[PDB]
UniProtKB/Swiss-Prot annotation, chains A, B:
This is AimR transcriptional regulator. It holds the Pfam family AimR. NCBIfam families: lysogeny_AimR. Signal peptide: none annotated. Homodimer. Interacts with the viral arbitrium peptide, this interaction changes the oligomeric state of AimR from an active dimer to an inactive monomer leading to lysogeny. GO terms for biological process: latency-replication decision. Transcriptional regulator which is part of the latency-replication switch system that decides at the onset of infection whether to replicate and lyse the host or to lysogenize (latency) and keep the host viable. Activates the transcription of the aimX locus. Transcriptional activation of aimX seems to lead to the productive viral replication (lytic cycle), aimX possibly acting as a regulatory non-coding RNA. Keywords: Activator, Latency-replication decision, Transcription, Transcription regulation. The keyword Cell membrane does not apply. InterPro entries: AimR-like.
Length: 390, 390
């Protein structure tokens, strides 16, 4: 038996009313499938939603430990194992997901094989093990048949564009996703829908289309019970408030911090967000990570030092950054910081260049402001604001 | 008998060797079709090229008078009348063309009707009688069947984009034209081919892609015996030399002048080209038309006055221009002239704005230069040079 099955059976002997309870939490609407699941090995709910909602309602503090068990004990050729693959990737449970994936690409179900290979391409692109060209080529050679992997093959490209700072392709691509074509796996369709909400929130943020951003993050939160999507919803709301409402932005970052207490990845993410917030508002910054050589963290140190006219320290940090390789992502902020330290307009023109190149219409308000403060001609500021990059 | 036929017979009585001559000039391969044409009323050559080349070889000085007769005597349902519609439009013989068109939209031949209606939409758009939106709607409602009008419906849009200063759609649109699909009318295919040569020459000019421009105009000249296409080929070559080679630009404009002696439109066109050339090079300008209220001519008056620091006179002309309506190209040039008169950077930024909006990467060298003379930061100039309008 499965740890989940063991625990449910134990807890049943002491509380019978759980059955009508669990059945309602699982959507079932008469407990026969619950009974069947508990009493017969290898039995499966029609939708992965059922066992997930049960585990979240009855054993939240154990969700990982149990589901890692359950997922890894599934027949890989089933609909439940494909649903479990998406469950793993969505929660960023990369152990469950990666093992599932190597079991799925070798197996004898065509659908599970296709899922495994596409999600494999997503994981390889995520870790910069293959190029985007190689990802597209591989996806093309798969002759994807299912609507689910038709949608996800576009989704993984969206994630890659988001994390590499290549925002201009995102809008046209996300419009191509059509989730109404998913009819066989409602768990996958609903989770993909949440993904689309968060991604559209991000696209709206990067277009400086801010009310929209927050609305789509609202929809994402209402549509999910997955911690990852809640985390990035609060991150995006708070970030959309970066230039306008200090307390509400910090409030969303602190909410996200509070729901991801034990998870160090999310913790680092919200700490970096609060650090950037305090640097934008030129306040004292207790969120700076002084024991890091990541480009983000060093940039935020330099930003703070620049804010408080600690020019020797800022110059030391920028030397550190000079000895590191930047992607086009990081370069705009690099030139913004150099421009502020050196009192230099040309640097702000370079920063604007790279914000345009990445099609980032949100953060580009930082260099523009500086040019405005330095007395830049108003019509010229309009021009720089409205032209864009090929 | 047609005037053409009358003259051909008259000259035949006096010179027999003309048969083998005309037959070779008409492409024929033997005089059998020539004799058929002369002996049977209303009989047509398989290609309209034949009578055109004959008239050009034997009665050049009369080409219009004869062909107007011939074209207006044609059975409108025939291939020769469709070929003659393209002949009239290509030579800008608006009398022949408009009469042909009203006769062809009324007839019972579906091909001739379609030609007539599409060319009608072209002439109405040319004369600003309908908007581009209305042209597109009417073209769509025509359910075009023939390849010829598939190509020409795009060609007329290209002409409208060129003459309104909306250059950015032109490249993608011209790439959609596929003349190899025209198999029934070789006169129309070859004349369209010349049209595409001239248009691509212009698109390359507007992209500041100059050697390419001259190559396509070179091809246009080699592909034609039609005066209108030679005129605009020489106009475009000379224009491509505007900022580099004064003598060769003037040479091409004077050539165009010399081959279009009696035609007042072409004469005005080359005089305006020479006027602009001399203003770009800040020379004495005998080519200015002081008896005009068109935007071009007034702008060149102001340009000359500004060149020679006659600021009161330039201000007077620019007052006149202020009381007139401009398109985006002409507005970019307006802000260039204002920028030079007032020595004002913001005006040059507006000029850049409208050159970008029209996707004119050639004339935009005028305001940029001035900004450079006023000491504009080079990195900023790089930025303005590389960013574009949405």
């Amino acid at each position: 038996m499965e740890l989940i099955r063991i625990a449910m059976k134990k807890d049943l002997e002491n509380d019978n009313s759980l059955m009508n309870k669990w059945a309602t939490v699982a959507g079932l609407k008469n407990p026969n499938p619950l009974y069947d699941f508990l009493n017969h090995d290898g039995k499966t709910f029609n939708e992965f939603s059922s066992i997930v909602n049960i585990v979240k309602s009855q054993y939240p503090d154990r969700e990982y430990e149990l589901m890692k068990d359950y997922c890894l004990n599934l027949d890989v050729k089933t609909k439940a194992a494909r649903s479990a693959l998406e469950y793993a990737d969505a929660n960023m449970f990369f152990e469950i997901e990666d093992v599932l994936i190597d079991s799925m690409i070798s197996c004898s179900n065509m659908k599970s094989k296709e899922y495994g290979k596409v999600y494999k391409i997503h994981r390889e692109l995520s870790n910069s093990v293959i190029t985007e060209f190689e990802a597209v080529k591989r996806l093309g050679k798969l002759n994807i048949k299912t609507p689910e992997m038709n949608s996800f093959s576009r989704l993984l490209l969206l994630y890659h564009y988001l994390s590499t700072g290549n925002f201009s392709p995102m809008a046209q691509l996300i419009k191509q996703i059509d989730l109404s074509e998913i009819s066989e796996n409602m768990y996958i369709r609903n989770t993909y829908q949440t993904r689309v909400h968060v991604l559209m929130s991000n696209i709206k943020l990067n277009e400086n289309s801010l009310e929209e951003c927050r609305e789509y993050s609202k929809k994402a939160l209402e549509s999910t019970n997955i911690l990852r999507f809640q985390v990035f919803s609060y991150l995006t709301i708070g970030n959309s408030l970066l230039f306008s409402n200090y307390e509400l932005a910090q409030e969303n970052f602190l909410k996200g911090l509070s729901i991801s207490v034990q998870n160090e990845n999310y913790n680092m993410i919200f700490q970096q967000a609060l650090c950037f917030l305090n640097n934008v508002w030129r306040k004292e910054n207790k969120w700076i990570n002084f024991e890091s050589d990541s480009i983000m963290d060093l940039q935020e140190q330099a930003h703070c030092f620049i804010n408080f006219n600690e020019n020797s320290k800022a110059k030391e940090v920028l030397d550190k950054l000079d000895l590191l390789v930047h992607n086009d992502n990081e370069l705009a902020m690099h030139y913004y910081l150099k421009g502020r330290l050196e009192q230099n307009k040309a640097c702000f023109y370079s920063s604007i260049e790279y914000f345009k190149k990445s099609n980032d219409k949100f953060l580009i308000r930082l260099p523009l402001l500086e040019l405005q403060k330095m007395g830049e001609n108003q019509k010229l500021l309009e021009l720089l604001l409205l032209l864009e990059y090929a």
